[PDB]
Amino acid sequence: EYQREGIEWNFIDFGLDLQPCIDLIEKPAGPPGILALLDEECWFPKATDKSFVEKVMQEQGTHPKFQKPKQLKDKADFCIIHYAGKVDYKADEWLMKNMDPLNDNIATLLHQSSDKFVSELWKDVDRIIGLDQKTRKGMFRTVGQLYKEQLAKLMATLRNTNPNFVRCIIPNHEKKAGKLDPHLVLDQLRCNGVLEGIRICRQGFPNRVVFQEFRQRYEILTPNSIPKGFMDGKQACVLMIKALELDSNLYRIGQSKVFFRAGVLAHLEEERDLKITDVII
Amino acid sequence: SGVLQLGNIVFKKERNTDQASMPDNTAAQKVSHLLGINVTDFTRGILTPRIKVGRDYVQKAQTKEQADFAIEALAKATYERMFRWLVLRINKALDKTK
Amino acid sequence: MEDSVGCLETAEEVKRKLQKDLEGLSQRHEEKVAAYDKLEKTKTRLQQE
Amino acid sequence: MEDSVGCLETAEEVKRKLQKDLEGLSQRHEEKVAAYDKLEKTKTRLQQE
Amino acid sequence: MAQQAADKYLYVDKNFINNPLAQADWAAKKLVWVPSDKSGFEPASLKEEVGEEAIVELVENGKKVKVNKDDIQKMNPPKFSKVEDMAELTCLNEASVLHNLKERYYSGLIYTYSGLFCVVINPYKNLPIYSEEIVEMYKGKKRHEMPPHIYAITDTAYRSMMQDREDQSILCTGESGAGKTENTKKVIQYLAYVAS
Numbered sequence: 001e002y003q004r005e006g007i008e009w010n011f012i013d014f015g016l017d018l019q020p021c022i023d024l025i026e027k028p029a030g031p032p033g034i035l036a037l038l039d040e041e042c043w044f045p046k047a048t049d050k051s052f053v054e055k056v057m058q059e060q061g062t063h064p065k066f067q068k069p070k071q072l073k074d075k076a077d078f079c080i081i082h083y084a085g086k087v088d089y090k091a092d093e094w095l096m097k098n099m100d101p102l103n104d105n106i107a108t109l110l111h112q113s114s115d116k117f118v119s120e121l122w123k124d125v126d127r128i129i130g131l132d133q134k135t136r137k138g139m140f141r142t143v144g145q146l147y148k149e150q151l152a153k154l155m156a157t158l159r160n161t162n163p164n165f166v167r168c169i170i171p172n173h174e175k176k177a178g179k180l181d182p183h184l185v186l187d188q189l190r191c192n193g194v195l196e197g198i199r200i201c202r203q204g205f206p207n208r209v210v211f212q213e214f215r216q217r218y219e220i221l222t223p224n225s226i227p228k229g230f231m232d233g234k235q236a237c238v239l240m241i242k243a244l245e246l247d248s249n250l251y252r253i254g255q256s257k258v259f260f261r262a263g264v265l266a267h268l269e270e271e272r273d274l275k276i277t278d279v280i281i
Numbered sequence: 282s283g284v285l286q287l288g289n290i291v292f293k294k295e296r297n298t299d300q301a302s303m304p305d306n307t308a309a310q311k312v313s314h315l316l317g318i319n320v321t322d323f324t325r326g327i328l329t330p331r332i333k334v335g336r337d338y339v340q341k342a343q344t345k346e347q348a349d350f351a352i353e354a355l356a357k358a359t360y361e362r363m364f365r366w367l368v369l370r371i372n373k374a375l376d377k378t379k
Numbered sequence: 380m381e382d383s384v385g386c387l388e389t390a391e392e393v394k395r396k397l398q399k400d401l402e403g404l405s406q407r408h409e410e411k412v413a414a415y416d417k418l419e420k421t422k423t424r425l426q427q428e
Numbered sequence: 429m430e431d432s433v434g435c436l437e438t439a440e441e442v443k444r445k446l447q448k449d450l451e452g453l454s455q456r457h458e459e460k461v462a463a464y465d466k467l468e469k470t471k472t473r474l475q476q477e
Numbered sequence: 478m479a480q481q482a483a484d485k486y487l488y489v490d491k492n493f494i495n496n497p498l499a500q501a502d503w504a505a506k507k508l509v510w511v512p513s514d515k516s517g518f519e520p521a522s523l524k525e526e527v528g529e530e531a532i533v534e535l536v537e538n539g540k541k542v543k544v545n546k547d548d549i550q551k552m553n554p555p556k557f558s559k560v561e562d563m564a565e566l567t568c569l570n571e572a573s574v575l576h577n578l579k580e581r582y583y584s585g586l587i588y589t590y591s592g593l594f595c596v597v598i599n600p601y602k603n604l605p606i607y608s609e610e611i612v613e614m615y616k617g618k619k620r621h622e623m624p625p626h627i628y629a630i631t632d633t634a635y636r637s638m639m640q641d642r643e644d645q646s647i648l649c650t651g652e653s654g655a656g657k658t659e660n661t662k663k664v665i666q667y668l669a670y671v672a673s
């Protein structure tokens with residue numbers, strides 16, 4: 001937004017970017033990821049657990065977010081250096097969970113059960129999978145692909161709104177009240193980006209209002225400042241900021257919005273209400 | 282209660298061939314009475330799932346481990362469907378005003 | 380053969396010298412990374428400060 | 429003689445690869461030194477300011 | 478009396494901070510943060526530097542331990558003690574943020590702002606900061622008008638949605654057992670009690 005609005009600002013590289021791991025997981029095209037490989041091996045011609053693990057190790061072996069489980073595979077098959085920490089996964093019964101096979105006979109029996117509740121529960125049976133030794137009206141989707149479609153629809157919806165993040169931290173893993181673990185809290189603040197999230201608000205301009213919106217919402221502060229008539233929206237805000245005696249390092253005029261530091265609008269809101277206090281009363 | 286009763290069927294391994302057997306079908310009868318289905322058909326489907334091999338129908342064989350995995354998958358699907366129905370009913374009750 | 384073997388000694392000796400210089404030159408940029416990161420860490424903290 | 433010449437070619441290829449790696453590593457030190465001086469130069473006026 | 482008792486776990490008495498003499502004494506003492514093996518970051522006084530390092534003494538024990546110059550972090554004056562907004566800290570760093578979070582948690586303040594997103598810490602105990610009186614108090618109050626609280630964030634989001642006419646999303650991120658479920662519960666309760 002800063003680059004689009006055209007304002008004095010330098011690109012700050014925070015370093016927080018979990019794109020590599022998200023791609024290794026979900027990226028279907030290019031190098032087959034974990035989910036892509038599991039979906040490709042979802043069929044049952046010759047794939048198994050060991051074969052799937054070998055294929056994954058051969059494909060996504062050089063990825064930086066991929067390592068072996070300790071020295072030997074005693075209780076895990078691979079690791080994924082997530083943003084929080086390293087997790088030891090076990091590729092046991094993964095193909096079955098991805099396919100989710102079900103008995104067709106028992107499914108049909110439950111669908112036609114005498115009970116009304118059981119019949120309503122199994123009313124939808126055209127999406128059940130249960131074959132043995134590619135599309136099928138798009139109903140042959142695995143648990144991994146189904147979750148990706150549900151998550152994609154969710155992430156696409158949250159992006160259209162104004163997310164109000166509420167970060168939650170845990171003191172310790174002992175469920176003890178009043179005992180704060182600094183070693184555990186420090187590891188969370190690093191991956192959560194609490195430090196990087198505060199510097200962008202202080203050094204940046206989290207506040208920003210449109211030229212037209214900034215006029216009607218703050219014209220009562222400096223009524224006798226703009227010529228009583230027609231005036232450009234951009235040039236009109238310049239006269240208001242000059243009359244308010246605001247420092248040059250507290251706002252940035254762009255091409256369509258007027259940015260502000262963290263705490264400028266809070267002061268104008270109080271001054272605006274105090275001006276109309278005699279009118280509201 | 283039916284989901285809870287599912288799994289208690291202690292399948293036995295036949296001494297002759299590798300085929301599942303239900304010597305004690307009390308849990309099966311209880312599950313059938315709870316879910317509201319037949320016992321003979323449920324047993325025949327769990328021990329001999331009727332599926333076509335490409336042309337005609339044939340009663341495929343199932344082992345002890347295969348039968349246990351099928352029972353577990355059926356219970357998981359039943360619980361998932363129950364949770365989905367509950368969520369749908371909650372949404373309908375919450376979205377009934379305007 | 381001595382001429383070819385003689386040239387191999389020069390190439391082998393030069394290769395050994397390059398290896399000794401590589402490990403020595405590698406430490407130049409490797410050790411500089413510590414000072415580079417130290418200056419960057421001090422500069423990053425100074426920029427924030 | 430042909431086999432000995434082959435060893436020289438393989439040895440020369442090794443020393444040649446080491447020379448190419450040294451040039452790349454030397455460029456890193458030269459680039460790091462130039463970047464290191466930038467941080468050192470940017471820290472002088474930074475501390476003064 | 479319930480509201481008066483719950484106010485203890487919300488507001489902070491600023492009368493015990495206003496002291497220019499204390500700030501001057503702290504500045505003259507020159508204190509900084511240093512790494513620790515059992516407390517994240519502990520205070521320490523800065524002494525004469527020795528090359529790329531500087532010897533420091535721990536305010537707790539008083540042992541002269543050598544610490545690298547890169548691991549040392551500046552300490553905030555006493556004025557920034559249990560601040561209401563983490564974005565107002567002067568010496569923003571990991572040590573200062575951890576110290577502020579610890580002071581707010583041990584004092585009965587799990588909520589702490591941070592620019593545009595609030596931070597919460599699982600108290601593992603039913604606090605009295607949840608009642609109808611508190612919900613009514615936070616009704617129609619700006620973010621900088623009441624102490625940090627999920628009700629404040631909910632009210633701010635509701636006001637933004639009603640003004641800008643743009644949708645909102647009260648997202649909650651954190652490890653397993655951090656308090657996301659309780660935060661969502663309280664947000665829904667506040668929305669049902671206010672937006673009725």
Ligand SMILES: Nc1ncnc2c1ncn2[C@@H]1O[C@H](COP(=O)(O)OP(=O)(O)O)[C@@H](O)[C@H]1O
Nearest residue numbers: 599600601602603604653654655656657658659
């Ligand atoms: N803000 C809070 N205040 C009091 N207790 C809490 C709070 N957040 C969590 N808890 C306690 O932590 C326990 C586990 O919480 P949990 O449901 O795991 O949270 P989440 O769903 O965010 O992981 C609960 O029994 C609850 O009493």
